[PDB]
RNA sequence: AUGCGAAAGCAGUUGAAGACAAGUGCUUGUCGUUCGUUAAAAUGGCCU
């Protein structure tokens, strides 16, 4: 639809349709979406992240939500997520960025003190230690790629 | 220490006691990045109290 | 090539350019994947930097630098993300401090 | 200028025309036709300012005496040249490292 | 004060000003943690010198 | 203070502040917010007329200043525009993309 | 080194004629000279 690409391509858009365009939308318009939309609603932003359709619109959507909206709000929607489907995405995440590791800390600051098990943490911890230890080695990387007495001499010249 | 390390390199192979300075300079600082890598994580600790 | 005194004698070899090649297919598949497990291909990169950045220097001025500027980039967008890797860290040490708690 | 109003001296290139040496000095009295001096600064040069840069040879300022017998130039390098214009003579007065 | 916030953390998560009650901690912390990356430029380099010195 | 994290950045920002101390225009590049200032957070409003604390232009903002409690005047990269504030809607615009 | 962009960077740029000086008609180098484009050196440092 080339009417509709051009109203996702105009900037603003002021009520209805990005009220509720998700459940109309939901593959190349959709992409067209996630790459331009003014307005649209955390919860359907959320759910579509942690929907494991994952076409990289993980890294998409995940890109234009740490964008444009706040933390606290994030905190207090991804509080309002549903645990089960968190597993999913924590599981999926140590099987296999910047986008991503910060959705994982604010994940992570979401869910908070409570409800951690000990295989699930000790996953992460060895998943995120082995990046670590990489990541630090390629930082060095980038730094580098940043960066009288002859006394006596017994020789000849050709003559 | 970065613009000397970055002139006098010549001097540094032929003399023994800055060898002896260099060596201790990479424990301080391996010393020191230790502290504070673990600074951020005690920060970011309190990040998830709030 | 596998262990690091052969890497420097090798180096010492090839020294002795084809190593400036050796940077290219080192470069090109660097910045193909950059969080790559393996501790043989960086190792390569640091060592032949610390070893004889000067004629890496001084050979060129198109063929090495324009991936160069690529390594360089991804690189740097690693060293950005290295402090939040450190608060996850700490993140997931206060929870297993706390489950430990939780047991004792 | 001179600071009285008598006198004016400036250069010329007529001797990069007809010469290795590019410019001729000149200072000519204006009311009365008392004075008439004309001289190539490849004379008024050292030489040993010629095998270094261009910037010790751009003379970038100059001032006469009033009554007409020392003449100051300023090279770009931070040298102030004096000439007794008498034997057409130098002296150096040397503090200046810009222009 | 690893160990403060392991246990307490029910009453700190109970307190709002958690900023104005941890003031000093909270700049101390800023302090050195974004002082970090010069010192790992400087290892860096320090390292670099030191491995092409005492190879040889 | 209010610090959002936000990995965006706006080279061109700008704000305004109302004569009564209490609604801060924090104007980021082409969405501007009104805050009530005791708590800097957006204006939360039970009565919901479509006043919202939330606006889109069309291009990053240049410049907003109020010229009295009644009327908000901003300036984008295209245009000039002119808005109430008893009532959420636009009042005046002016078309200035030649200029 | 210009354009764009956030303090990241992201693309591209470095080309012509002239005239002269030196070494031996030839090579280099220079420009108080023009076109075309988004384009380190003369021991000489701060008043009372």
Same mark, same amino acid.
């Given at each position: ?159 | ?50 | ?104 | 200028?001179?600071? +009285? ?30 004075? +008439? ?17 261009? +910037? ?9 005496? +009033? ?33 | ?56 | ?42 204006? *939360?409003?039970? *009565? ?5 604390? *939330? ?45």
């Amino acid at each position: 639809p080339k009417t509709l690409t051009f109203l996702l391509t105009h900037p603003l858009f002021p009520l209805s349709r990005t009220r509720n365009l998700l459940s109309l939308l939901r593959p190349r318009l959709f992409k067209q979406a996630i790459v331009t939309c003014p307005n649209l609603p955390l919860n359907e932003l959320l759910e579509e992240l942690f929907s494991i359709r994952n076409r990289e619109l993980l890294l998409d959507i995940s890109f234009r939500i740490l964008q444009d909206f706040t933390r606290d709000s994030i905190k207090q929607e991804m509080k309002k997520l549903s645990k089960l489907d968190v597993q999913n995405f924590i599981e999926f995440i140590t099987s296999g960025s910047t986008q991503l590791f910060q959705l994982l800390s604010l994940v992570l600051d979401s869910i908070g003190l409570f409800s951690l098990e000990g295989a699930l943490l000790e996953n992460l911890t060895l998943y995120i230690d082995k990046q670590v230890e990489i990541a630090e080695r390629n930082t060095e990387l980038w730094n580098l790629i940043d960066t009288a007495l002859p006394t006596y001499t017994m020789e000849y010249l050709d003559i | 220490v970065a613009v000397v390390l970055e002139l006098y390199g010549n001097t540094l192979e032929s003399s023994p006691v800055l060898q002896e300075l260099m060596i201790d300079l990479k424990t301080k600082v391996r010393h020191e990045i230790h502290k504070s890598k673990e600074a951020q994580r005690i920060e970011g600790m309190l990040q998830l109290l709030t | 090539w596998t262990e690091p005194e052969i890497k420097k004698f090798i180096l010492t070899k090839i020294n002795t350019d084809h190593l400036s090649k050796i940077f290219l297919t080192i470069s090109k598949s660097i910045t193909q994947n950059p969080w790559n497990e393996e501790n043989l291909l960086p190792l390569w990169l640091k060592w032949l930097l610390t070893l004889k950045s000067g004629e890496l220097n001084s050979i060129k001025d198109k063929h090495t630098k324009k991936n160069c500027k690529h390594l360089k980039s991804a690189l740097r967008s690693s060293e950005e993300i290295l402090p939040v890797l450190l608060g996850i860290q700490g993140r997931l040490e206060m929870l297993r401090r706390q489950a430990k708690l939780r047991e004792d | 200028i001179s600071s +009285n109003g008598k006198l004016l001296a400036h250069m010329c290139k007529d001797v990069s025309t007809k010469d290795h040496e590019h410019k001729s000095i000149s200072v000519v009295s204006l009311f009365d036709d008392s004075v +008439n001096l004309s001289f190539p600064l490849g004379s008024i040069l050292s030489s040993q300012t010629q095998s270094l840069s261009y +910037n010790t040879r751009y003379v970038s300022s100059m001032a006469i005496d +009033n009554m007409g017998q020392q003449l100051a130039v300023g090279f770009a390098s931070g040298v102030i040249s004096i000439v007794s214009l008498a034997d057409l003579q130098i002296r150096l007065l040397k503090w200046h490292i810009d222009s | 004060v690893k160990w403060c916030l392991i246990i307490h953390g029910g009453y700190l998560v109970s307190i709002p000003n958690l900023m104005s009650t941890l003031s000093s901690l909270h700049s101390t912390l800023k302090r050195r943690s974004d002082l970090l990356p010069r010192l790992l430029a400087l290892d860096a380099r320090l390292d670099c010198t030191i491995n092409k010195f005492k190879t040889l | 203070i209010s610090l959002p994290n936000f990995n965006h950045f706006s080279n061109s920002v700008s704000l305004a502040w109302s004569q009564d101390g209490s609604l801060i225009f924090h104007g980021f590049d082409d969405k501007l917010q009104i805050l009530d200032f005791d708590t800097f957070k957006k204006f *939360e409003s039970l *009565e919901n007329t479509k006043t919202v604390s *939330e606006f889109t232009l069309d291009s990053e903002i240049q410049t907003v200043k109020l010229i009295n409690d009644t009327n908000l005047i901003v300036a984008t990269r295209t245009t000039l525009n002119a808005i109430n504030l008893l009532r959420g809607q636009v009042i005046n615009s002016f078309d200035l993309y030649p200029f």
